[PDB]
Nucleic acid binder design. Sequence first.
RNA 1: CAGGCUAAUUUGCGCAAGAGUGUACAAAAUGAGUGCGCGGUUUGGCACCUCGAUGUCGGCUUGACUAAUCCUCAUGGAUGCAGAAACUAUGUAGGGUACGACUGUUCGUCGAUUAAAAAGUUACAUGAGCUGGGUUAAAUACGUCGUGAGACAGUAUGGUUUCUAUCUUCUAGAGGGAAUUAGAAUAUAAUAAGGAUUAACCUUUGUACGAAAGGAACAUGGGGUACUAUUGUUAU
RNA 2: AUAAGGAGAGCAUGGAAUAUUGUUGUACGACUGUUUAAUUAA
Lengths: 268, 186, 119, 105, 46
Amino acid sequence: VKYGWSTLPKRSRPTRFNQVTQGLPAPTSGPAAALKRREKTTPLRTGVLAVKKGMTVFMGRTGARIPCTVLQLDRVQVVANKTRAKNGYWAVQVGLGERRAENVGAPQLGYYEAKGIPPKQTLAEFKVRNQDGLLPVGVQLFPDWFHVGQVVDVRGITRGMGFAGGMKRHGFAGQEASHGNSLNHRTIGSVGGSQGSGSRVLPGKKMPGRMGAQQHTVQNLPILMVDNELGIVVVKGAVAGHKGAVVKVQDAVKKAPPPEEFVEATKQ
Amino acid sequence: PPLPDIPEGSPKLMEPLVKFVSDELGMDDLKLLDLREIDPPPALGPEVLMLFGTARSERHLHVSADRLVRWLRNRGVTAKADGLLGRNELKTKLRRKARKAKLLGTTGLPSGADDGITTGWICVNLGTLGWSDMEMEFKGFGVPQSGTTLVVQLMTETRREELALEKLWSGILRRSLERQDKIAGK
Amino acid sequence: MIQLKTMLNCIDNSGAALVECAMVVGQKRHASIGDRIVVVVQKQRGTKVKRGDIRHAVVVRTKQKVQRRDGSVVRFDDNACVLINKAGDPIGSRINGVVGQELRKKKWSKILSMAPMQA
Amino acid sequence: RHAARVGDVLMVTHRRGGEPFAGVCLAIRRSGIDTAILLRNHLGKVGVEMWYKIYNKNVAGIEIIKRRAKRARRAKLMYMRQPKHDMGSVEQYVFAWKKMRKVLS
Amino acid sequence: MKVHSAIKKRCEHCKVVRRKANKRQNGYLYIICPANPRHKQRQGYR
RNA sequence: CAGGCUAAUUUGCGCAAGAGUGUACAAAAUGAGUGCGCGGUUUGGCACCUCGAUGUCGGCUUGACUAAUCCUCAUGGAUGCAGAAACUAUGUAGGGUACGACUGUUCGUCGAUUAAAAAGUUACAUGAGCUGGGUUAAAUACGUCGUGAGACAGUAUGGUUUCUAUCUUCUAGAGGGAAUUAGAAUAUAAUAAGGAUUAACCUUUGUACGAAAGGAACAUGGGGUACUAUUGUUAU
RNA sequence: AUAAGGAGAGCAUGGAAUAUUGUUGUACGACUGUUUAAUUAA
Ligand SMILES: [K+]
Ligand SMILES: [Mg+2]
Ligand SMILES: [Mg+2]
Ligand SMILES: [Mg+2]
Ligand SMILES: [Mg+2]
Ligand SMILES: [Mg+2]
Ligand SMILES: [Mg+2]
Ligand SMILES: [Mg+2]
Ligand SMILES: [Mg+2]
Ligand SMILES: [Mg+2]
Ligand SMILES: [Mg+2]
Ligand SMILES: [Mg+2]
Ligand SMILES: [Mg+2]
Ligand SMILES: [Mg+2]
Ligand SMILES: [Mg+2]
Ligand SMILES: [Mg+2]
Ligand SMILES: [Mg+2]
Ligand SMILES: [Mg+2]
Ligand SMILES: [Mg+2]
Ligand SMILES: [Mg+2]
Ligand SMILES: [Mg+2]
Ligand SMILES: [Mg+2]
Ligand SMILES: [Zn+2]
């Protein structure tokens, strides 16, 4: 095998010939079984691309100081809808910002040409639960897409930290400072056992290396403020990345979807 | 004997409370101290109304205290008894005690003078229930709302004499009143 | 932030003047205002506590700055505490000094019933 | 000129209770909505400092009860923690201030 | 219940049954007794 | 010295049988002297084998695995399970099992917390990763033995701890590539490999149970001095 | 024994060096010295 329990050649396409309508058991794997075991968690509605603008506090009447991060929506449009009959899952492609036509390539210039949308800066897909989550292509999403008090998840790329050691990367304790230590203060110490442990370093061993600059998701962050004119969506807590980086905001998977009235008002 | 007069201006929960702790709990002596005239608000709330009661025995106090917390819980007030051990908080203390005896072999049983399972004072702090706006001069945001704080101190006869918290807060009262007159003048 | 080997002041009329912290009870993080600790009496004041007696105490004052929920940050000039028994009942009967405002939210009504000042 | 300067003595009245805290301003951090001020006072015999957010709603009001004779030659007055320059207790200026209000009012 | 390597009937009401045998395992021999629940025994370890 | 063979012995266990204890009643618990066994931890035997050792081991760093379970989860038995606690046994190794004092050390001993402060294998797991508590010296003093040189599993103080990583493994990041196949831009699924993984407290109508003293299981809630939910407080 | 104990415009009469943990009590050797150049200075 190469990946998992399957020995099937990667160039063979037998999916259409093993159909449940012919009396075969519904497979436990595949796009169909992957969507069925994620139906509850999958967000009902699409998300928005926002730009991290900074951190502050939301001072509330009577005495509440709530640390919060500001995320700005900069011309968030709907670019494409990914259906299940065409792609294998439900999702909405969202665009953010703009880019100069010269910098956009011809393959992408003809892609926006077939939609009536100006070239965007970035693109991202947000998985929706069913066909009711697909929106018309070319509609702008404003901060009012969310409501105050709605918990969301913010996905952003964490700050880069280059080649990290063992202390900063894996929280290693290090070694002593002055009681006879010899050139080994911030080093990782032992890397394994001896002949009884395989006479090798074991896969997955924690070692120095690059840290940061990866996607990180912060779940269950309420929405404290929603200002359309400013274009901002203030969320509680911290968010991954630097100021000026694009992040993905969507409803929380571990929390119930917003009421039926809200999901319909926003669509209305 | 009679009941402690209710200071004019107390909340509507002050009259049933005094009746409850007297006619249903069985406190020997009850004295309600009006300490709502202290210039610097004490470290219990704006205006305290310490109610002092005497229990027959530590066991009676522990039951009466827990009986009062459940009586106030049926009205919305969420009181926190400072000295009332919980159901499982007592298990762990008993487990460790009995566990150590098993290992040692009953060599510390007569030496467990202080265990943390018995107390002769319980302070049921009801908190500041009724909040209202004051009247101040600020040209500032608003007025610093104040509210009456209720505190029920139930202890035994032996423990009510050692502490002597009745003469502590009484002395504090008159002191804060004399100092107040200095500012005004008369 | 009170740890092991830390020396604190006793502000109650228990007969202790200078105690040393021996254990942070119930937590791994260092004791802050309103936290329970186990101390060892190191000095006295000219049923009192004799030097060397191990008792439980509560931190009331910390030199480390403590941030309240509203953004107020309080700092004291020294670390103080009041001796208590394992039950939670003040050994002393009167507090002479100012205690932090974090004793109100951690249910220390007994310490706050000795008429201590607050900051 | 009329604003409160570092080195002056202020008095912060708290929303919940009205408990006033008086002290000499040692620092002013201007950080947008989180602007804060540091007040030092000796309560009892203990020196207690306090950072206060001026734009929070838990501070009912701030008043200047005593101004500094000469402007301080420093932005921060952290040297007032040393016994040499420690102003000590501020109760004197608080008592003298309340009297003025009562007599006038 | 008592897991013995030698299970025996201890009264007239004790019955020998093989339970928990399914398409994935062989099961164990049990001594089930409705009169006295102290006679409950099993043969084999999971 | 480690590895290898053996398993007398063990501070490693299981099963079978049942003298006996259990007011009664073998198997709730307990189990004499024994029998049949597993296993490779302690003290040994052997000697295939010259090599990092005589406390063969301690601490640090970093693990991986085992399950014969100290804590947390499910559960059978208990004239000796009323409740609570505790006992015995069956499932189960996901995550934890801390801190300090005195002891050269692990052996250990104690202090105070804690839900608990359980074990073992990996060449003391790991010194081309650290330490030197050790592993060996020459100096000196004392003690014991010897006619003496000396010896001692003695005692005390002191006493140079090398290496720029070739290969495999490993952690990261790259050059080229073969792709249903002319090659690209952008967004991407099935699937794969890993990560996260603690516990406590209040809340039962102080209820069930109990003569009383005592005192549960089940379940909900404890995100808000923002929204919202909820409980109170005053005004209409 | 320099015992100890009392003391020498702005935050500071301001850098460097002087400048080092202090005190007390034990064991051994009276003391200053000498010793295995290059692991043992006692
Ligand atoms: K070094
Ligand atoms: Mg960078
Ligand atoms: Mg370190
Ligand atoms: Mg191999
Ligand atoms: Mg190898
Ligand atoms: Mg018999
Ligand atoms: Mg078990
Ligand atoms: Mg049963
Ligand atoms: Mg039970
Ligand atoms: Mg799991
Ligand atoms: Mg070791
Ligand atoms: Mg090695
Ligand atoms: Mg010699
Ligand atoms: Mg000799
Ligand atoms: Mg030397
Ligand atoms: Mg190489
Ligand atoms: Mg996927
Ligand atoms: Mg849990
Ligand atoms: Mg509110
Ligand atoms: Mg000499
Ligand atoms: Mg030499
Ligand atoms: Mg030398
Ligand atoms: Zn039977």
